[PDB]
Amino acid sequence: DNQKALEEQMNSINSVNDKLNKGKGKLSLSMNGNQLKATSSNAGYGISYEDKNWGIFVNGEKVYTFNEKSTVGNISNDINKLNIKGPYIEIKQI
């Protein structure tokens, strides 16, 4: 909408944080220059226990795709091993 040209890591990610921090497994979004580090609380346990098709998109391109019954900690920190420069990343299932 607007953050596109500016920072990008704004409310677009925090709206994600509120959605992912829903009780069970939860992915937190944070960026440091060339480094996406998403931390998973709930001891790595998953969001859900059912098959949902998940995904992350950086500026219209696919970053990572996963399932809610997976260990959000093995999911998230894999994404972070990559240490991605991803500024505008949409973390939401499809």
Side-chain angles (χ1 to χ4, degrees):
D1 56 283
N2 172 269
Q3 293 57 267
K4 190 181 180 298
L6 289 309
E7 290 70 59
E8 292 166 277
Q9 305 76 209
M10 296 295 90
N11 292 89
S12 307
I13 72 150
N14 302 91
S15 301
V16 174
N17 276 272
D18 285 278
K19 292 177 190 182
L20 298 191
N21 279 269
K22 44 73 229 56
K24 215 159 165 174
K26 68 208 85 188
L27 185 156
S28 304
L29 295 71
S30 189
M31 307 76 185
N32 296 89
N34 60 255
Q35 178 190 270
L36 190 289
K37 53 161 186 174
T39 61
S40 182
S41 186
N42 227 87
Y45 284 87
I47 291 81
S48 186
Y49 74 97
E50 309 177 286
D51 289 273
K52 289 79 172 301
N53 35 267
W54 242 94
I56 300 175
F57 319 95
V58 60
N59 298 90
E61 278 71 72
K62 289 242 293 180
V63 179
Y64 202 91
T65 301
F66 63 98
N67 197 332
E68 259 173 50
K69 37 158 61 173
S70 302
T71 33
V72 211
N74 285 318
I75 298 301
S76 54
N77 251 149
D78 267 50
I79 300 177
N80 316 328
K81 300 173 189 297
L82 325 182
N83 253 208
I84 32 190
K85 47 76 231 295
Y88 181 79
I89 53 179
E90 302 185 307
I91 306 197
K92 86 269 191 168
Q93 57 85 213
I94 36 207

Coordinates of all heavy atoms in Angstrom, one line a residue:
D1 N 0.8 -1.2 0.0 CA 0.0 0.0 0.0 C 0.9 1.3 0.0 O 0.6 2.2 -0.8 CB -1.0 0.0 1.2 CG -0.2 -0.1 2.5 OD1 0.2 -1.3 2.9 OD2 -0.1 0.9 3.2
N2 N 1.9 1.3 0.9 CA 2.7 2.5 1.0 C 4.1 2.2 1.5 O 5.1 2.8 1.0 CB 2.0 3.5 1.9 CG 2.9 4.7 2.2 OD1 3.6 4.7 3.2 ND2 2.8 5.8 1.4
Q3 N 4.2 1.3 2.5 CA 5.4 0.9 3.1 C 6.4 0.4 2.0 O 7.6 0.4 2.2 CB 5.2 -0.2 4.1 CG 4.4 0.3 5.4 CD 3.1 0.8 5.1 OE1 2.9 2.1 4.9 NE2 2.1 0.0 4.9
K4 N 5.8 0.0 0.9 CA 6.5 -0.5 -0.3 C 7.8 0.3 -0.6 O 8.8 -0.4 -0.8 CB 5.6 -0.4 -1.5 CG 6.0 -1.1 -2.7 CD 5.1 -0.9 -3.9 CE 5.5 -1.6 -5.1 NZ 6.8 -1.1 -5.6
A5 N 7.7 1.6 -0.6 CA 8.9 2.4 -1.0 C 9.7 2.8 0.3 O 10.9 3.1 0.1 CB 8.4 3.6 -1.7
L6 N 9.1 2.7 1.4 CA 9.8 3.2 2.6 C 10.6 2.0 3.3 O 11.6 1.6 2.9 CB 8.8 3.8 3.6 CG 8.3 5.2 3.2 CD1 9.4 6.1 2.8 CD2 7.3 5.1 2.1
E7 N 10.0 1.5 4.5 CA 10.7 0.5 5.3 C 10.3 -0.9 4.9 O 11.1 -1.7 4.6 CB 10.4 0.7 6.8 CG 11.1 1.9 7.4 CD 10.5 3.2 6.9 OE1 9.3 3.4 7.1 OE2 11.2 4.1 6.3
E8 N 8.9 -1.1 4.8 CA 8.3 -2.4 4.5 C 8.1 -3.3 5.7 O 7.0 -4.0 5.8 CB 9.1 -3.1 3.4 CG 9.0 -2.4 2.0 CD 10.1 -2.9 1.0 OE1 11.2 -2.5 1.1 OE2 9.7 -3.8 0.2
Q9 N 9.1 -3.3 6.6 CA 9.0 -4.2 7.8 C 8.0 -3.6 8.8 O 8.0 -4.0 10.0 CB 10.3 -4.4 8.5 CG 11.4 -4.9 7.6 CD 12.0 -3.8 6.7 OE1 12.5 -4.2 5.6 NE2 12.0 -2.6 7.1
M10 N 7.1 -2.7 8.4 CA 6.2 -2.1 9.3 C 5.0 -3.0 9.7 O 5.2 -4.2 9.8 CB 5.6 -0.8 8.7 CG 6.7 0.3 8.4 SD 7.5 0.9 9.9 CE 8.9 -0.2 10.1
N11 N 3.8 -2.4 10.0 CA 2.6 -3.1 10.5 C 2.4 -4.4 9.7 O 1.8 -5.3 10.2 CB 1.4 -2.2 10.4 CG 1.5 -1.1 11.4 OD1 2.0 0.0 11.1 ND2 0.9 -1.3 12.6
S12 N 2.8 -4.4 8.4 CA 2.6 -5.6 7.6 C 3.1 -6.9 8.3 O 2.6 -7.9 8.1 CB 3.3 -5.4 6.2 OG 2.9 -4.2 5.7
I13 N 4.2 -6.7 9.0 CA 4.7 -7.9 9.8 C 4.1 -8.1 11.1 O 3.9 -9.2 11.6 CB 6.3 -7.8 9.9 CG1 6.7 -6.8 11.0 CG2 7.0 -7.6 8.6 CD1 7.9 -7.1 11.7
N14 N 3.7 -6.9 11.8 CA 3.2 -7.0 13.1 C 1.8 -7.5 13.1 O 1.4 -8.3 14.0 CB 3.2 -5.6 13.7 CG 4.5 -4.9 13.8 OD1 4.9 -4.2 12.8 ND2 5.2 -5.1 14.9
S15 N 1.0 -7.2 12.0 CA -0.3 -7.8 11.8 C -0.1 -9.3 11.7 O -1.0 -10.1 12.2 CB -0.9 -7.3 10.5 OG -1.1 -5.9 10.6
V16 N 1.0 -9.8 11.2 CA 1.4 -11.2 11.1 C 1.7 -11.7 12.5 O 1.3 -12.8 12.9 CB 2.6 -11.4 10.2 CG1 3.0 -12.9 10.3 CG2 2.3 -11.1 8.8
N17 N 2.4 -10.9 13.3 CA 2.8 -11.3 14.7 C 1.5 -11.5 15.5 O 1.5 -12.5 16.3 CB 3.7 -10.2 15.3 CG 5.1 -10.3 15.0 OD1 5.9 -11.1 15.6 ND2 5.5 -9.6 13.9
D18 N 0.5 -10.7 15.4 CA -0.7 -10.8 16.2 C -1.5 -12.1 15.7 O -2.2 -12.7 16.5 CB -1.6 -9.6 16.0 CG -1.1 -8.4 16.8 OD1 -1.4 -8.3 18.0 OD2 -0.5 -7.5 16.2
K19 N -1.3 -12.5 14.5 CA -2.0 -13.6 13.9 C -1.4 -14.9 14.3 O -2.0 -15.9 14.5 CB -2.1 -13.5 12.4 CG -3.0 -12.3 11.9 CD -3.0 -12.2 10.4 CE -3.6 -10.9 9.9 NZ -3.6 -10.8 8.5
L20 N 0.0 -14.9 14.3 CA 0.7 -16.1 14.6 C 0.9 -16.3 16.1 O 0.9 -17.5 16.6 CB 2.1 -15.9 14.0 CG 2.1 -15.8 12.4 CD1 3.5 -16.0 11.9 CD2 1.2 -16.8 11.8
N21 N 0.9 -15.2 16.9 CA 0.9 -15.4 18.3 C -0.5 -15.6 18.9 O -1.1 -14.8 19.6 CB 1.5 -14.1 19.0 CG 3.0 -14.1 19.0 OD1 3.7 -14.6 19.9 ND2 3.7 -13.6 17.9
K22 N -1.1 -16.7 18.4 CA -2.5 -17.0 18.7 C -2.7 -18.0 19.9 O -3.8 -18.5 20.1 CB -3.2 -17.5 17.4 CG -2.4 -18.6 16.6 CD -2.3 -19.9 17.3 CE -0.8 -20.4 17.4 NZ 0.0 -19.4 18.1
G23 N -1.6 -18.3 20.6 CA -1.7 -19.2 21.7 C -0.7 -20.3 21.6 O 0.3 -20.4 22.4
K24 N -0.9 -21.2 20.6 CA 0.0 -22.4 20.4 C 1.2 -21.9 19.6 O 1.6 -20.7 19.8 CB -0.8 -23.4 19.6 CG -0.4 -24.8 19.9 CD -1.5 -25.8 19.5 CE -1.0 -27.2 19.4 NZ -2.1 -28.2 19.2
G25 N 1.9 -22.7 18.9 CA 3.1 -22.4 18.2 C 3.0 -21.1 17.5 O 2.0 -20.7 16.8
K26 N 4.1 -20.3 17.6 CA 4.0 -18.9 17.2 C 5.3 -18.4 16.6 O 6.4 -18.6 17.2 CB 3.6 -18.1 18.4 CG 4.6 -18.0 19.5 CD 3.9 -17.8 20.8 CE 3.5 -19.2 21.4 NZ 2.7 -19.0 22.6
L27 N 5.2 -17.7 15.4 CA 6.4 -17.2 14.7 C 6.4 -15.7 14.9 O 5.4 -15.0 14.7 CB 6.3 -17.6 13.3 CG 7.5 -17.3 12.4 CD1 7.6 -18.2 11.2 CD2 7.4 -15.8 11.9
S28 N 7.6 -15.2 15.4 CA 7.7 -13.8 15.6 C 8.6 -13.2 14.5 O 9.7 -13.8 14.1 CB 8.4 -13.5 16.9 OG 7.6 -14.1 18.0
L29 N 8.3 -12.1 13.9 CA 9.0 -11.5 12.8 C 9.9 -10.4 13.2 O 9.5 -9.5 13.8 CB 8.0 -11.0 11.7 CG 7.1 -12.0 11.0 CD1 6.0 -12.5 12.0 CD2 6.4 -11.4 9.8
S30 N 11.2 -10.5 12.8 CA 12.1 -9.4 13.0 C 13.2 -9.5 12.0 O 13.6 -10.6 11.5 CB 12.7 -9.5 14.4 OG 13.4 -8.3 14.7
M31 N 13.7 -8.3 11.5 CA 14.7 -8.2 10.5 C 15.8 -7.3 11.0 O 15.6 -6.3 11.7 CB 14.1 -7.6 9.2 CG 12.8 -8.3 8.7 SD 11.3 -7.9 9.6 CE 10.2 -9.0 8.9
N32 N 17.0 -7.7 10.6 CA 18.2 -6.9 10.9 C 19.0 -6.8 9.6 O 19.9 -7.6 9.4 CB 19.0 -7.5 12.0 CG 18.3 -7.5 13.3 OD1 17.6 -8.4 13.7 ND2 18.5 -6.4 14.1
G33 N 18.7 -5.8 8.8 CA 19.4 -5.6 7.5 C 19.3 -6.8 6.6 O 18.3 -7.0 5.9
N34 N 20.3 -7.7 6.5 CA 20.3 -8.8 5.6 C 19.9 -10.1 6.3 O 20.2 -11.2 5.9 CB 21.8 -9.1 5.1 CG 22.8 -9.4 6.2 OD1 23.6 -8.5 6.6 ND2 22.6 -10.5 6.9
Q35 N 19.1 -9.9 7.4 CA 18.8 -11.0 8.3 C 17.4 -11.1 8.8 O 17.0 -10.2 9.6 CB 19.8 -11.0 9.5 CG 19.5 -12.1 10.4 CD 20.3 -12.0 11.7 OE1 21.4 -12.4 11.9 NE2 19.7 -11.3 12.7
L36 N 16.7 -12.0 8.3 CA 15.4 -12.3 8.9 C 15.6 -13.4 9.9 O 16.2 -14.4 9.7 CB 14.5 -12.8 7.7 CG 13.0 -13.1 8.0 CD1 12.8 -14.2 8.9 CD2 12.4 -11.8 8.6
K37 N 15.1 -13.1 11.1 CA 15.2 -14.0 12.3 C 13.8 -14.1 12.9 O 13.3 -13.2 13.6 CB 16.2 -13.5 13.3 CG 16.0 -12.1 13.8 CD 16.7 -11.8 15.1 CE 16.3 -10.4 15.7 NZ 16.8 -10.2 17.0
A38 N 13.1 -15.2 12.6 CA 11.8 -15.4 13.1 C 11.9 -16.4 14.2 O 12.4 -17.6 14.0 CB 10.9 -15.9 12.0
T39 N 11.6 -16.0 15.4 CA 11.7 -16.9 16.6 C 10.3 -17.5 16.9 O 9.3 -16.9 16.8 CB 12.1 -16.1 17.8 OG1 11.2 -15.1 18.1 CG2 13.5 -15.5 17.6
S40 N 10.4 -18.8 17.2 CA 9.2 -19.6 17.5 C 9.1 -19.9 19.0 O 10.0 -20.6 19.5 CB 9.2 -20.8 16.7 OG 8.0 -21.6 16.9
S41 N 8.0 -19.4 19.6 CA 7.8 -19.7 21.0 C 6.9 -20.9 21.1 O 6.5 -21.5 20.0 CB 7.2 -18.5 21.7 OG 7.1 -18.8 23.1
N42 N 6.4 -21.3 22.3 CA 5.6 -22.5 22.5 C 6.5 -23.7 22.4 O 6.0 -24.8 22.1 CB 4.4 -22.6 21.6 CG 3.1 -22.9 22.3 OD1 2.4 -22.1 22.9 ND2 2.8 -24.2 22.4
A43 N 7.8 -23.5 22.7 CA 8.8 -24.6 22.7 C 8.8 -25.3 21.3 O 9.1 -26.5 21.3 CB 8.5 -25.6 23.8
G44 N 8.6 -24.6 20.3 CA 8.8 -25.1 18.9 C 7.5 -25.9 18.4 O 7.5 -26.3 17.3
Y45 N 6.5 -26.0 19.3 CA 5.3 -26.7 18.9 C 4.6 -25.9 17.8 O 4.8 -24.7 17.6 CB 4.4 -26.9 20.1 CG 4.8 -28.0 21.1 CD1 5.8 -27.7 22.1 CD2 4.3 -29.3 20.9 CE1 6.2 -28.8 22.9 CE2 4.7 -30.3 21.8 CZ 5.6 -30.0 22.8 OH 6.0 -31.0 23.6
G46 N 3.7 -26.6 17.1 CA 3.0 -26.0 16.0 C 1.8 -25.1 16.3 O 1.3 -25.2 17.5
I47 N 1.4 -24.3 15.4 CA 0.1 -23.6 15.5 C -1.0 -24.5 15.8 O -1.8 -24.3 16.7 CB -0.2 -22.8 14.2 CG1 0.8 -21.7 13.9 CG2 -1.6 -22.3 14.3 CD1 2.0 -22.1 13.2
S48 N -1.2 -25.4 14.8 CA -2.3 -26.2 14.8 C -2.0 -27.7 14.7 O -0.8 -28.0 14.9 CB -3.2 -25.8 13.6 OG -4.4 -26.5 13.5
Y49 N -2.9 -28.5 14.5 CA -2.7 -29.9 14.4 C -3.4 -30.5 13.2 O -3.6 -31.7 13.1 CB -3.3 -30.5 15.7 CG -4.8 -30.6 15.8 CD1 -5.5 -31.8 15.5 CD2 -5.6 -29.5 16.2 CE1 -6.9 -31.8 15.5 CE2 -6.9 -29.5 16.3 CZ -7.6 -30.7 15.9 OH -9.0 -30.7 16.0
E50 N -3.7 -29.6 12.3 CA -4.3 -30.0 11.0 C -3.5 -29.5 9.8 O -2.6 -28.6 10.0 CB -5.7 -29.4 10.9 CG -6.6 -29.7 12.2 CD -7.9 -29.0 12.1 OE1 -8.0 -27.7 12.3 OE2 -8.9 -29.7 11.9
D51 N -3.8 -30.0 8.7 CA -3.0 -29.6 7.5 C -3.5 -28.3 6.9 O -4.5 -28.3 6.2 CB -3.1 -30.8 6.4 CG -2.3 -32.0 6.8 OD1 -1.1 -32.1 6.5 OD2 -2.9 -32.9 7.4
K52 N -2.7 -27.3 7.1 CA -2.9 -26.0 6.4 C -1.7 -25.7 5.5 O -0.6 -26.0 5.8 CB -3.0 -24.9 7.4 CG -4.3 -24.8 8.2 CD -4.3 -25.8 9.4 CE -5.5 -25.6 10.3 NZ -5.6 -24.2 10.8
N53 N -2.0 -25.2 4.3 CA -1.0 -24.8 3.4 C -0.5 -23.4 3.6 O -1.2 -22.4 3.4 CB -1.4 -25.0 1.9 CG -2.9 -24.6 1.7 OD1 -3.7 -25.5 1.7 ND2 -3.2 -23.4 1.4
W54 N 0.7 -23.3 4.2 CA 1.2 -22.0 4.6 C 2.2 -21.4 3.6 O 2.6 -22.1 2.7 CB 2.0 -22.2 5.9 CG 1.4 -21.5 7.0 CD1 0.5 -21.9 7.9 CD2 1.7 -20.1 7.3 NE1 0.2 -20.9 8.8 CE2 0.9 -19.8 8.4 CE3 2.5 -19.2 6.7 CZ2 0.9 -18.5 8.9 CZ3 2.5 -18.0 7.2 CH2 1.8 -17.6 8.3
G55 N 2.5 -20.1 3.8 CA 3.5 -19.5 2.9 C 4.0 -18.1 3.3 O 3.3 -17.4 4.0
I56 N 5.2 -17.8 2.8 CA 5.8 -16.5 3.0 C 6.2 -16.0 1.6 O 6.7 -16.7 0.8 CB 7.0 -16.5 3.9 CG1 6.5 -17.1 5.3 CG2 7.6 -15.2 4.0 CD1 7.7 -17.2 6.2
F57 N 5.9 -14.7 1.4 CA 6.2 -14.0 0.1 C 7.0 -12.7 0.3 O 6.6 -11.9 1.0 CB 4.9 -13.7 -0.6 CG 3.9 -14.8 -0.5 CD1 2.9 -14.8 0.5 CD2 3.9 -15.9 -1.4 CE1 2.0 -15.8 0.6 CE2 3.0 -17.0 -1.2 CZ 2.0 -16.9 -0.3
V58 N 8.1 -12.6 -0.4 CA 8.9 -11.4 -0.3 C 8.7 -10.6 -1.6 O 9.1 -11.0 -2.7 CB 10.4 -11.7 -0.1 CG1 11.0 -12.6 -1.2 CG2 11.2 -10.4 0.0
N59 N 8.1 -9.4 -1.5 CA 7.8 -8.5 -2.6 C 7.2 -9.3 -3.8 O 7.7 -9.0 -4.9 CB 9.1 -7.8 -3.0 CG 9.7 -7.0 -1.9 OD1 10.5 -7.4 -1.1 ND2 9.3 -5.7 -1.8
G60 N 6.3 -10.1 -3.5 CA 5.6 -10.8 -4.6 C 6.2 -12.2 -5.0 O 5.6 -12.9 -5.8
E61 N 7.4 -12.5 -4.4 CA 8.0 -13.8 -4.7 C 8.0 -14.7 -3.5 O 8.0 -14.3 -2.4 CB 9.5 -13.6 -5.1 CG 9.7 -13.2 -6.6 CD 9.2 -11.8 -6.9 OE1 9.9 -10.8 -6.5 OE2 8.2 -11.6 -7.6
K62 N 7.9 -16.0 -3.8 CA 7.8 -17.0 -2.7 C 9.1 -17.1 -1.9 O 10.2 -17.2 -2.5 CB 7.4 -18.3 -3.3 CG 6.0 -18.4 -3.8 CD 5.2 -19.4 -3.1 CE 5.6 -20.8 -3.4 NZ 4.8 -21.8 -2.7
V63 N 9.0 -17.1 -0.6 CA 10.2 -17.3 0.3 C 10.2 -18.8 0.8 O 11.1 -19.5 0.6 CB 10.1 -16.4 1.5 CG1 11.3 -16.6 2.4 CG2 10.1 -14.9 1.0
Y64 N 9.1 -19.1 1.5 CA 9.1 -20.4 2.2 C 7.6 -20.8 2.3 O 6.7 -20.0 2.4 CB 9.6 -20.3 3.6 CG 10.1 -21.6 4.2 CD1 11.4 -22.0 4.1 CD2 9.2 -22.3 5.0 CE1 11.8 -23.2 4.6 CE2 9.6 -23.5 5.6 CZ 10.9 -24.0 5.4 OH 11.4 -25.1 5.9
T65 N 7.4 -22.1 2.2 CA 6.0 -22.6 2.3 C 6.0 -23.8 3.2 O 6.8 -24.7 3.2 CB 5.6 -23.1 0.8 OG1 5.6 -22.0 -0.1 CG2 4.2 -23.7 0.8
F66 N 5.0 -23.9 4.1 CA 5.0 -24.9 5.2 C 3.6 -25.3 5.6 O 2.6 -25.0 5.0 CB 5.8 -24.5 6.4 CG 5.4 -23.2 7.1 CD1 4.7 -23.3 8.3 CD2 5.8 -22.0 6.7 CE1 4.3 -22.2 9.0 CE2 5.4 -20.8 7.4 CZ 4.7 -21.0 8.6
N67 N 3.5 -26.0 6.8 CA 2.2 -26.5 7.3 C 2.1 -26.1 8.8 O 3.1 -26.1 9.5 CB 2.2 -28.0 7.1 CG 0.8 -28.7 7.3 OD1 0.0 -28.1 8.0 ND2 0.6 -29.8 6.6
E68 N 0.9 -25.9 9.2 CA 0.6 -25.4 10.6 C 0.9 -26.5 11.6 O 1.0 -26.2 12.8 CB -0.8 -24.9 10.7 CG -0.9 -23.4 10.7 CD -2.3 -22.9 10.7 OE1 -3.1 -23.4 11.5 OE2 -2.7 -22.0 9.8
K69 N 0.8 -27.7 11.2 CA 1.0 -28.8 12.2 C 2.5 -29.2 12.3 O 2.9 -30.2 12.9 CB 0.2 -30.1 11.8 CG 0.1 -30.2 10.3 CD -0.2 -31.7 9.9 CE -1.5 -32.1 10.4 NZ -1.9 -33.5 9.9
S70 N 3.3 -28.4 11.6 CA 4.8 -28.6 11.7 C 5.3 -27.8 12.9 O 4.7 -26.9 13.5 CB 5.4 -28.1 10.4 OG 4.9 -28.8 9.3
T71 N 6.6 -28.1 13.3 CA 7.2 -27.4 14.4 C 7.7 -26.0 13.9 O 8.6 -25.9 13.1 CB 8.4 -28.2 14.9 OG1 9.0 -28.9 13.8 CG2 8.0 -29.2 16.0
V72 N 6.9 -25.0 14.3 CA 7.2 -23.7 13.9 C 8.6 -23.2 14.2 O 9.1 -22.2 13.6 CB 6.2 -22.7 14.5 CG1 5.9 -21.5 13.6 CG2 4.9 -23.3 14.9
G73 N 9.3 -23.9 15.0 CA 10.6 -23.6 15.4 C 11.6 -24.1 14.4 O 12.7 -23.5 14.2
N74 N 11.3 -25.3 13.9 CA 12.1 -25.9 12.9 C 11.9 -25.2 11.5 O 12.7 -25.1 10.7 CB 11.9 -27.4 12.8 CG 12.5 -28.2 13.9 OD1 13.6 -27.9 14.3 ND2 11.7 -29.1 14.5
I75 N 10.6 -24.7 11.4 CA 10.2 -24.0 10.2 C 10.9 -22.6 10.2 O 11.6 -22.2 9.3 CB 8.7 -23.8 10.2 CG1 8.0 -25.2 10.1 CG2 8.3 -22.9 9.0 CD1 8.4 -26.0 8.8
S76 N 10.6 -21.8 11.3 CA 11.1 -20.4 11.4 C 12.6 -20.3 11.3 O 13.1 -19.6 10.4 CB 10.6 -19.8 12.7 OG 11.0 -20.5 13.8
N77 N 13.3 -21.0 12.1 CA 14.8 -20.8 12.2 C 15.5 -21.4 11.0 O 16.6 -21.0 10.7 CB 15.4 -21.4 13.5 CG 15.9 -20.3 14.4 OD1 15.8 -20.4 15.6 ND2 16.3 -19.1 13.9
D78 N 14.8 -22.3 10.2 CA 15.4 -22.7 8.9 C 15.4 -21.5 8.0 O 16.4 -21.2 7.4 CB 14.6 -23.8 8.2 CG 15.1 -25.2 8.5 OD1 15.3 -25.5 9.7 OD2 15.3 -25.9 7.6
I79 N 14.3 -20.8 8.0 CA 14.1 -19.5 7.3 C 15.2 -18.5 7.7 O 15.7 -17.7 6.9 CB 12.8 -18.8 7.6 CG1 11.6 -19.8 7.1 CG2 12.6 -17.5 6.9 CD1 10.3 -19.2 7.5
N80 N 15.7 -18.6 8.9 CA 16.6 -17.7 9.4 C 18.0 -18.2 9.2 O 19.0 -17.3 9.2 CB 16.4 -17.5 10.9 CG 14.9 -17.3 11.3 OD1 14.1 -16.8 10.5 ND2 14.5 -17.7 12.5
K81 N 18.2 -19.5 9.1 CA 19.5 -20.0 8.6 C 19.9 -19.3 7.3 O 21.1 -18.9 7.1 CB 19.5 -21.5 8.4 CG 19.1 -22.3 9.6 CD 18.9 -23.8 9.3 CE 18.3 -24.5 10.4 NZ 19.2 -24.6 11.6
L82 N 18.9 -19.1 6.5 CA 19.1 -18.5 5.2 C 19.5 -17.1 5.3 O 20.1 -16.5 4.4 CB 17.7 -18.5 4.5 CG 16.8 -19.8 4.8 CD1 15.5 -19.7 4.0 CD2 17.6 -21.0 4.4
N83 N 19.3 -16.5 6.5 CA 19.6 -15.1 6.8 C 19.2 -14.2 5.6 O 20.1 -13.8 4.8 CB 21.0 -14.9 7.2 CG 21.2 -14.6 8.7 OD1 22.1 -13.9 9.1 ND2 20.2 -15.0 9.5
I84 N 17.9 -14.0 5.4 CA 17.4 -13.3 4.3 C 17.3 -11.8 4.4 O 17.0 -11.3 5.5 CB 16.0 -13.9 3.9 CG1 15.2 -14.4 5.1 CG2 16.2 -15.0 2.9 CD1 14.0 -15.1 4.8
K85 N 17.5 -11.1 3.3 CA 17.4 -9.7 3.2 C 16.0 -9.2 3.1 O 15.7 -8.0 2.9 CB 18.2 -9.2 2.0 CG 17.9 -10.0 0.8 CD 16.6 -9.7 0.1 CE 15.7 -10.9 -0.2 NZ 16.3 -11.8 -1.2
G86 N 15.0 -10.2 3.2 CA 13.6 -9.9 2.9 C 13.0 -8.8 3.6 O 12.9 -8.8 4.8
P87 N 12.8 -7.6 2.9 CA 12.2 -6.4 3.5 C 10.7 -6.5 3.7 O 10.2 -6.4 4.8 CB 12.6 -5.3 2.5 CG 12.5 -6.0 1.2 CD 13.0 -7.4 1.5
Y88 N 10.0 -6.8 2.6 CA 8.5 -6.9 2.7 C 8.2 -8.4 2.5 O 8.1 -8.9 1.3 CB 7.9 -6.1 1.6 CG 6.3 -6.2 1.6 CD1 5.6 -5.5 2.6 CD2 5.7 -6.9 0.7 CE1 4.2 -5.5 2.6 CE2 4.3 -7.0 0.7 CZ 3.6 -6.3 1.7 OH 2.2 -6.4 1.7
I89 N 7.9 -9.1 3.6 CA 7.6 -10.5 3.5 C 6.2 -10.7 4.1 O 5.9 -10.3 5.3 CB 8.6 -11.4 4.3 CG1 8.8 -10.8 5.7 CG2 9.9 -11.4 3.5 CD1 9.8 -11.7 6.4
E90 N 5.3 -11.3 3.3 CA 4.0 -11.6 3.8 C 3.9 -13.0 4.3 O 3.9 -14.0 3.5 CB 3.0 -11.4 2.6 CG 3.0 -10.0 2.1 CD 2.0 -9.8 1.0 OE1 1.9 -10.6 0.1 OE2 1.2 -8.8 1.2
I91 N 3.8 -13.1 5.6 CA 3.7 -14.4 6.2 C 2.3 -14.7 6.5 O 1.7 -14.2 7.5 CB 4.6 -14.4 7.5 CG1 6.1 -14.0 7.2 CG2 4.6 -15.8 8.2 CD1 7.1 -14.4 8.2
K92 N 1.7 -15.5 5.7 CA 0.3 -16.0 5.9 C 0.0 -17.2 5.0 O 0.6 -17.3 3.9 CB -0.7 -14.8 5.6 CG -1.1 -14.7 4.1 CD -0.2 -13.8 3.3 CE -0.8 -13.5 1.9 NZ -0.1 -12.4 1.2
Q93 N -0.9 -18.0 5.4 CA -1.2 -19.2 4.7 C -2.1 -18.9 3.5 O -2.7 -17.9 3.4 CB -1.8 -20.3 5.6 CG -3.0 -19.9 6.4 CD -4.3 -20.1 5.6 OE1 -5.2 -19.4 5.7 NE2 -4.3 -21.2 4.7
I94 N -2.2 -19.9 2.6 CA -2.8 -19.6 1.3 C -4.0 -20.5 1.1 O -4.9 -20.5 1.9 CB -1.7 -19.9 0.2 CG1 -0.8 -21.1 0.6 CG2 -0.9 -18.7 -0.1 CD1 0.5 -21.1 0.1

